[PDB]
Amino acid sequence: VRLTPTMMLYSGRSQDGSHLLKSGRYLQQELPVRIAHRIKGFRSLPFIIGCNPTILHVHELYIRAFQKLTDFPPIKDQADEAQYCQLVRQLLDDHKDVVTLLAEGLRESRKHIEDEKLVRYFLDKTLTSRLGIRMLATHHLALHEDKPDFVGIICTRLSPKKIIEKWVDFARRLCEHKYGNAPRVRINGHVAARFPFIPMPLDYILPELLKNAMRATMESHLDTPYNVPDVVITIANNDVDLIIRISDRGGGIAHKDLDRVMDYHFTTAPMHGFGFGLPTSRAYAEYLGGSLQLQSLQGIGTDVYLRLRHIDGREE
Ligand SMILES: Nc1ncnc2c1ncn2[C@@H]1O[C@H](COP(=O)(O)OP(=O)(O)O)[C@@H](O)[C@H]1O
Ligand SMILES: [Cl-]
Ligand SMILES: [Cl-]
Ligand SMILES: [Cl-]
Ligand SMILES: [K+]
Ligand SMILES: [Mg+2]
Ligand SMILES: [Xe]
Ligand SMILES: [Xe]
């Protein structure tokens, strides 16, 4: 139905809860293959990195997950599909702090290091496979519920302005709690657009980009925390993609850091996180068929351009 990388999100012709069985069976044939690929990923990690405790723990979670998934019998009826949903849920929860554990595990290993680009390739490949598995899984689960304007995790009439505002309020609150104020965010462009879209990736990316913009703005206006320049977001909606530009007046990204900011762990900083925001968002966007580009005006501010392809057709 709705495609993305090579994964499919089924648009269920409901009826006699029949579509659910077709989706459960798909999910059941898909998850163990994706889990195995990531186990191969841990097996090929440099020995010294792979021997790190936390990394081993995560490696063991993936083996365990592969085993429970492999041991569940083929879904034959509603009775099965329903217990499978309990398995999927237990796994999503068990793997809740995986990105966090990976970042910690890998943080130390590269005092010890290997092939400069070797780890980035590993984290890009692991984080995005994770996203895709969670999208598949969350979508099957959601196909049970009946939420207005959704087919599973797919919103049928998503408003970019509305999802942006949701994350603006969130980020502004993290920022006010920390600095006592937060820049206001103005939104322009196609503010009335509504189209079929999956909001999950935007739910990770948008708050990461807004956190970066608000902090850089606050950190560069220490003399007047009570009066800082607005962050400005422009929405461009065309038949090919959705573009969201986030411009701040927070001083820009220094020429001396420009080439490091897209590296996992790199950071200039607790609100910010742990240097994963940008490299993760870009991996996610490219995984989905879009991109994330930065334009730095050193001494003035930064423009961040997020592009995501529309479902599998154009759109207004
Ligand atoms: N909009 C921005 N303006 C200024 N600096 C930014 C901006 N976005 C990101 N950066 C810089 O890039 C670094 C990397 O950011 P990121 O990967 O999100 O990690 P973190 O926020 O946790 O440091 C930041 O620490 C900061 O130096
Ligand atoms: Cl092992
Ligand atoms: Cl195995
Ligand atoms: Cl999408
Ligand atoms: K970084
Ligand atoms: Mg960040
Ligand atoms: Xe899962
Ligand atoms: Xe998982």
Swiss-Prot record:
GO molecular function: [3-methyl-2-oxobutanoate dehydrogenase (acetyl-transferring)] kinase activity; ATP binding; protein kinase activity; protein serine kinase activity; protein serine/threonine kinase activity; protein serine/threonine phosphatase activity; pyruvate dehydrogenase (acetyl-transferring) kinase activity
Enzyme Commission number, as recorded: 2.7.11.1, 2.7.11.4
Record's subcellular location: Mitochondrion matrix; Mitochondrion
Keywords of the record: Acetylation, ATP-binding, Kinase, Mitochondrion, Nucleotide-binding, Phosphoprotein, Transferase, Transit peptide
Organs and tissues of expression: Expressed in heart and liver.
Protein's GO biological process: branched-chain amino acid catabolic process; isoleucine catabolic process; L-leucine catabolic process; lipid biosynthetic process; regulation of acetyl-CoA biosynthetic process from pyruvate; regulation of glucose metabolic process; spermatogenesis; valine catabolic process
Quaternary structure and interacting proteins, as annotated: Homodimer. Homotetramer. Dimerizes through interaction of two opposing nucleotide-binding domains. Interacts with E2 component of the branched-chain alpha-ketoacid dehydrogenase (BCKDH) complex. Competes with BCKDK for binding to the E2 component; this interaction is modulated by branched-chain alpha-keto acids. At steady state, BCKDH holoenzyme contains BCKDK and BCKDHA is phosphorylated. In response to high levels of branched-chain alpha-keto acids, the inhibitory BCKDK is replaced by activating PPM1K leading to BCKDHA dephosphorylation and BCAA degradation.
Name listed for the protein in its UniProt record: Branched-chain alpha-ketoacid dehydrogenase kinase
Organism field: Rattus norvegicus (Rat)
